[PDB]
Amino acid sequence: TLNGGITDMLTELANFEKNVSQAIHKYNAYRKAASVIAKYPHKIKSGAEAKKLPGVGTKIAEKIDEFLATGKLRKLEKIRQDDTSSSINFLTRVSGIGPSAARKFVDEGIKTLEDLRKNEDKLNHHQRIGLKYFGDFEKRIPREEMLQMQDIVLNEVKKVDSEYIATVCGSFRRGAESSGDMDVLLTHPSFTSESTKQPKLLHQVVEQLQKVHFITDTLSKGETKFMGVCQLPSKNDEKEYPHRRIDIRLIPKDQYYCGVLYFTGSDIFNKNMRAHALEKGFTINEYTIRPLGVTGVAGEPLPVDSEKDIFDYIQWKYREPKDRSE
DNA sequence: CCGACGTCGCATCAGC
DNA sequence: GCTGATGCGA
DNA sequence: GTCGG
Ligand SMILES: Nc1ccn([C@H]2C[C@H](O)[C@@H](COP(=O)(O)OP(=O)(O)[C@@H](Cl)P(=O)(O)O)O2)c(=O)n1
Ligand SMILES: Nc1ccn([C@H]2C[C@H](O)[C@@H](COP(=O)(O)O)O2)c(=O)n1
Ligand SMILES: [Cl-]
Ligand SMILES: [Cl-]
Ligand SMILES: [Cl-]
Ligand SMILES: [Mg+2]
Ligand SMILES: [Mg+2]
Ligand code: NA
Ligand code: NA
Ligand code: NA
């Protein structure tokens, strides 16, 4: 990491703006600049050099100059001193506690892990599970464990219905040596953009994974998206593995390529690519790519028979999953 | 100088 | 209940 | 906070 000091600074500023300021566009701007700087293949020597990169403007350039000269950023040194900002930033590290809930908890005197555990009463279901596994959810998953988890998920899915196809996406599909959680794209021929011919398609996979004690908790669940918790089995006398976040997304089978493009990410890559689509006159979601008429209303879905077809429409050279870790 | 910034699923709540 | 908005998340 | 028209 040539520029890790700068990128950490911008990331901390991004998180400040999201959690404390509740300024989602500043959050995205800071993360976009951190990402372009992270892939820049030179050790940055000045703010002016960084300002050449798209997403780095005047203000970030000045912060880079202060950071290069001093090793620090006074704006951040002060944010770290604000008790309210410290409290809010801590509380939002619990899954299910966002910017608004964190600020309300602080108002109510609930500011520390101690306070949260004393007040499970005041937590919704999601937050209660985020608190239960607070430590575990900050541990990363070695790719070796991702492979064991993939084996279980793919085999249990096959036992329910051999026509399911489960694909592990996220950073795993991008070839990362570790991942923050497990993301699973699911398809079944009974669920297409034209009809849903079988109910409970997601539910049946979730129940089977619960049956074998792989899924341990549910954060939210609907007809096409599961957000929950899972755990690898341990051997005799072994310490248990940490509990891990798992997301399962059921996507219409004929829309698999848009779905796997979405779920492979990264999230910044998707934002960048979707914004480029818009400048090229297209809109992309996890289901389709459609043209945008001058009216601004999306037209009919365009034929897609590969991930690369999506890149072709917007005049981008193809980028393998490994090259999408923005 | 300023409007737009990616797109959408599930949980929650307010008004009717 | 339904609908629409907001929060939080992918 | 940055960018493009
Ligand atoms: N705001 C977002 C968040 C996620 N996503 C997509 C892209 C992302 O790759 C996918 C899974 O989300 P996750 O937060 O798990 O991101 P990952 O790419 O898997 C890595 Cl941050 P990690 O989960 O391995 O740490 O969902 C998105 O489009 N927009
Ligand atoms: N989860 C998945 C994965 C692949 N597929 C289909 C889409 C393609 O037509 C086909 C090609 O397989 P693969 O992409 O794994 O090479 O598999 C699916 O329907 N659901
Ligand atoms: Cl903002
Ligand atoms: Cl600092
Ligand atoms: Cl669509
Ligand atoms: Mg992930
Ligand atoms: Mg723009
Ligand atoms: Na720039
Ligand atoms: Na949180
Ligand atoms: Na995830």
**Is A157 found in the same domain as A234?**
yes
A16 CB and strand D closer than 7 A:
no
If we measure between CA atoms, which residue out of A264, A262, A279, A236 comes closest to residue A321?
A: A264
> From the annotation, which residues of A make up the binding site for dTTP?
140, 171, 174, 180-181
- The amino acid sitting at A304 is V
> In Å, how far are A163, A214, A232, A238, A247 from A148, measured between CA atoms?
21, 11, 8, 16, 16
CA A4 to chain centre: 21
Does an H or E element contain A149, and which? helix A143-160
A244-250 and A182-187 strand pairing: parallel
**Is A236 found in the same domain as A165?**
yes
CA of A269 to the centre of ligand 1 (A): 10
* Edge-first strand listing for the sheet containing A225-230: A165-168, A182-187, A244-250, A225-230, A215-221
Question: What six digits make up the tokens of A42?
Answer: 């030179």
**Is A236 found in the same domain as A149?**
yes
Check which CATH number belongs to the domain holding A204 and give it.
Answer: 3.30.460.10
Q: Specify the experimental method.
A: X-ray
A264 lines ligand 2 (CB under 6 A): no
DSSP state, A138?
A: G
**Is A159 found in the same domain as A65?**
no
- Residues ≥6 apart with Cβ < 8 Å to A285: A258, A262
- Residues ≥6 apart with Cβ < 8 Å to A215: A206, A209, A228, A229, A230, A246
**Is A212 found in the same domain as A144?**
yes
A178-179 and A182-187 strand pairing: unpaired
Ligand nearest to the Cα of A30, by number: 3
A226 lines ligand 1 (CB under 6 A): no
Check which CATH number belongs to the domain holding A88 and give it.
Answer: 1.10.150.20
CA of A303 to the centre of ligand 9 (A): 38
Positions of A marked active-site? 63
Q: Work out which ligand 1 atom sits closest to the CA atom of A265.
A: 9
Residue for token pair 């007040």 = A119
A225 CB and strand B closer than 7 A:
yes
If we measure between CA atoms, which residue out of A244, A11, A12, A40 comes closest to residue A139?
A: A244
**Is A154 found in the same domain as A52?**
no
DSSP state, A194?
A: S
Which residue among A262, A277, A293 closes a domain?
A: A262
**Is A209 found in the same domain as A124?**
no
**First vs last C-alpha separation in chain A:** 14
A207: domain range? 140-262
**Is A110 found in the same domain as A173?**
no
- Residues ≥6 apart with Cβ < 8 Å to A146: A168, A172, A178, A179, A182
- The amino acid sitting at A138 is E
**Is A151 found in the same domain as A65?**
no
**Is A321 found in the same domain as A307?**
yes
Cα distance between residue A320 and residue A326, in whole Å = 12
Resolution (A): 1.9
The number of folded domains in chain A is 4
A54 CB and strand D closer than 7 A:
yes
> In Å, how far are A161, A279, A282 from A227, measured between CA atoms?
21, 33, 30
